[PDB]
Design a protein around this ligand. Structure first.
Ligand code: MYA
Ligand code: HWN
Ligand code: MG
Length: 411
């Protein structure tokens, strides 16, 4: 069934994952000196390339590869079009490792053919709460707590092979070379997500969408007019009224985040994320990088009351190419990023997210049912989509958990 994934240190079946009780490594300990110093072999017509993701032109080359060859729906209606500024943001966080950005090019002319990217993340990935309770029942607390310390690991994203080279077993080679470069830096675990089912997720959640511009979404067939609206004289008018939003935020202290807010935002975020079984730990530099506003990329607002920041939300922009409809070039989606609420109900905080996103010209707001995202689905008129995001570890045994015990947002 899986000629590549069967050879890797991942759980091989759903049954295996449902039997795991404690977090820890799959493979035997290895040293850096054990790991080949030479790049993984690749066909003579190709070469490995490490792009400089802080050079505008190298970012542009990766941008083009992904624009033309990255994730598309099965009906080929929409294809992600991450911007150049987004890619620089995502692939160069504090203390990033340039060698973890791995590309293949055709040696002759040097066309870019494939890419995969790793970035550092500090993750809590110790045994989940439910399984620590069972372990205490049983006298096994020491084993259950062994890997509780937040671990410095790799997050993988942006795996892409050019459409002309699909189904030639190039993706396994990129994965193996990325693994080698990570292992050479003495890191032995990775976290990754995909929409496809691979061996084997530790968690899975549905995607949810909230329409902001229903007329456009229906036109491009992202959305349908649902059957019950046919009881109405003007279905589209009633759809628009259904999703109508305020033109101004409701929370009076709302404003964009600024550098001086970093310590307080770090504090309330970390207190919140601490409650979840899998979640990142951020430095001040990482809070600054991932949350301060960046035009066209990330948008972050704080609620400041009596000169104190008590709540915040963030969202990021991923446009998609509208492949088949010629009336529109792009789908402009806002994705829910991190947030924390201490003064107001989460639904009140996130309504202001939708108002700001709509005001800024976004067409839809998307999220996965991680964090406390299910708490505002119905009131704020999100609907489940047909897709799922599955969360995976490489070289880490982990119990199956619910997606509401996951606090890592994937870009
Ligand atoms: C310690 C450090 C560890 C670091 C590494 C951690 C692991 C990171 C793992 C990567 C995390 C990526 C996170 C993201 O970026 S998820 C986004 C993935 N990108 C896309 O969907 C973009 C459009 N599609 C493509 O570019 C290609 O179809 C890809 C590149 C996806 C596959 O190329 P292609 O279609 O030309 O096929 P092949 O003949 O080369 O290879 C076939 C093998 O590939 C397995 N496959 C298919 N899709 C995925 C997938 N999304 N993750 C992992 N494996 C995948 C498949 O089961 C088969 O293996 P097996 O079933 O035969 O065994
Ligand atoms: C949290 N994410 C942002 C990055 C990933 N992003 C952009 C992403 N991934 C998706 N899937 C399942 C496949 C992509 C891979 N691999 C979908 S489906 C989706 C709808 C339109 C609402 C149905 C939005 C969405 N967004 C997921
Ligand atoms: Mg291939």
């Amino acid at each position: 069934a899986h000629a590549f994934w069967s050879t890797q240190p991942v759980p091989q079946t759903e049954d295996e994952t449902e039997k795991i009780v404690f977090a820890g490594p799959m493979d035997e300990p290895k040293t850096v000196a054990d790991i080949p110093e030479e790049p993984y072999p690749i066909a003579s017509t190709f070469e490995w390339w490490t792009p400089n993701m802080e050079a505008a032109d190298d970012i542009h080359a990766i941008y083009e590869l992904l624009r033309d060859n990255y994730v598309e729906d099965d009906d080929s209606m929409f294809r992600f079009n991450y911007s150049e500024e987004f890619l620089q943001w995502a692939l160069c966080p504090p203390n990033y490792i340039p060698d973890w950005h791995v590309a293949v090019r055709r040696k002759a002319d040097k066309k870019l053919l494939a890419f995969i990217a790793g970035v550092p993340v500090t993750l809590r990935m110790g045994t989940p709460k439910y399984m620590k309770v069972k372990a205490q029942e049983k006298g096994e607390g020491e084993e259950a707590a062994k890997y509780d310390e937040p671990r410095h690991i790799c997050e993988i994203n942006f795996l892409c092979v050019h459409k002309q080279l699909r189904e030639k077993r190039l993706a396994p080679i990129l994965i193996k070379e990325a693994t080698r470069r990570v292992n050479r830096t003495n890191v032995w675990q990775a976290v990754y997500t995909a929409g496809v089912l691979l061996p084997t997720p530790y968690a899975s959640g549905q995607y949810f969408h909230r329409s902001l511009n229903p007329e456009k979404l229906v036109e491009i067939r992202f959305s349908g007019i649902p059957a019950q609206y046919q009881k109405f004289q003007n279905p589209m008018a009633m759809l628009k009224r259904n999703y109508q939003l305020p033109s101004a935020p409701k929370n009076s202290g709302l404003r964009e985040m600024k550098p001086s807010d970093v310590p307080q935002v770090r504090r309330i975020l970390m207190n919140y994320l601490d409650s979840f079984d899998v979640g990142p730990v951020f430095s001040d530099a990482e809070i600054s990088h991932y949350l301060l506003p960046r035009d066209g990329v990330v948008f972050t607002y704080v609620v400041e009351n009596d000169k104190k920041v008590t709540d915040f939300f963030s969202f990021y922009r991923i446009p998609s190419t509208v492949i088949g409809n010629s009336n529109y070039n792009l789908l402009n989606a806002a994705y829910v990023h991190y947030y924390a609420a201490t003064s107001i109900p989460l639904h009140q905080l996130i309504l202001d997210l939708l108002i700001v996103a709509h005001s800024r010209g976004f067409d839809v707001c998307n999220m996965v049912e991680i964090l406390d995202n299910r708490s505002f689905v119905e009131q704020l008129k999100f609907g489940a989509g047909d897709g799922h995001l599955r969360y995976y570890f490489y070289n880490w045994a982990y119990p199956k958990i619910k997606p509401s015990q996951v606090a890592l947002v994937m870009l």
